[PDB]
From a paper:
AdCut was expressed and purified, and the structure was solved to a 1.5 Å resolution. Solving the structure of AdCut enabled the verification of the positioning of the functionally active catalytic triad, as well as providing an experimental structure for modeling substrate interactions. As expected from the high degree of sequence identity with IsPETase, the RMSD value between both structures is low, 0.41 Å (262 aligned residues). Consequently, the canonical catalytic triad of AdCut (residues S174, D220, and H251) aligns very well with that of IsPETase (residues S160, D206, and H237), with the residues surrounding the catalytic pocket very similar for both enzymes. However, despite these similarities, it is interesting to note subtle differences in the shapes of the two binding pockets. For PET, product formation (TPA, MHET, and BHET) shows that only IsPETase is able to catalyze this reaction, while AdCut did not cause any significant PET degradation above the negative control. The rate of production of succinic acid was slower and plateaued at a lower level compared to PBS and AdCut alone. This suggests that PET is binding to AdCut active sites and competitively inhibits the turnover of PBS. The restricted space surrounding the catalytic Ser174 residue in AdCut appears to be playing a key role in hindering the reaction. For AdCut with PET, the nucleophilic attack is sterically hindered with the Oγ–CC=O unable to adopt the necessary distance expected for the reaction.
The second enzyme, AdCut, is found in the bacteria Acidovorax delafieldii, which is able to grow on poly(butylene succinate) (PBS) as its sole carbon and energy source. IsPETase and AdCut are highly homologous (82% sequence identity and 89% sequence similarity). Given the sequence identity and the presence of the same catalytic triad, AdCut most likely uses the same reaction mechanism. Despite the enzymes showing a very high sequence identity of 82%, IsPETase shows significant hydrolysis activity for both polymers, whereas AdCut only shows significant hydrolysis activity for PBS.
Numbering used by the authors: 42 to 304
The structure:
Amino acid sequence: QTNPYERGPAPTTSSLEASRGPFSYQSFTVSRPSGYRAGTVYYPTNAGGPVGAIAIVPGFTARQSSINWWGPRLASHGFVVITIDTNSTLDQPDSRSRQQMAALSQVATLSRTSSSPIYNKVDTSRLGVMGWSMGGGGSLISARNNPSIKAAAPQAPWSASKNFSSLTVPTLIIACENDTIAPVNQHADTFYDSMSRNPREFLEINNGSHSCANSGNSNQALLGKKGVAWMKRFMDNDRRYTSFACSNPNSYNVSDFRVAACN
């Protein structure tokens, strides 16, 4: 069979490194956020069918601005994205996971609400999780707790829980070589090395500080290509993105690349 989740034309290096995919996007603020503080929903106006939904959580003391470049980037390729603010900026990773799932729950209900810009735009069975630092650990925790999640792509993850051996959710860990907040060999390395049952990839930005994948970063061409490709391959089962998702980028801006069980 045709894969009914395929959206957009065949990807290219340049179409993926571009700021924007083939779809127009708009956004709205969530009026009455349920179980988190605030949310901006990015969506394609014209994806040619329902698309999956991704919730993205900031790090400790941070807000939507740290992680919201992902909103337009992913929405323009055919995803509905919610970037959230947490109940408290001091929330820890387990709390962030709960709020991440709550945000996905509300994206889903809004997609079933006739009032909403995203009415009928979402396949609420196809969800992804992303986030920075403690929001990244929350994404791992979400994936651990809920194996039906299709994909995880946290960045510079921080988590006091170290054991993700149970993960079957395809996970791309974005890491920052010189991270002094969520040091790679105490966080990202440990998380990755615990995994064995899931498609997975480790993409570490050369000399990256803790904020190496945040809004305004100097590696959007590479990071955006990889994040979109991962979400396409695993959220849409879209085999046109296997090579993009699974390949070594062979970039000098990558200090360490690892991959396993990726086709």
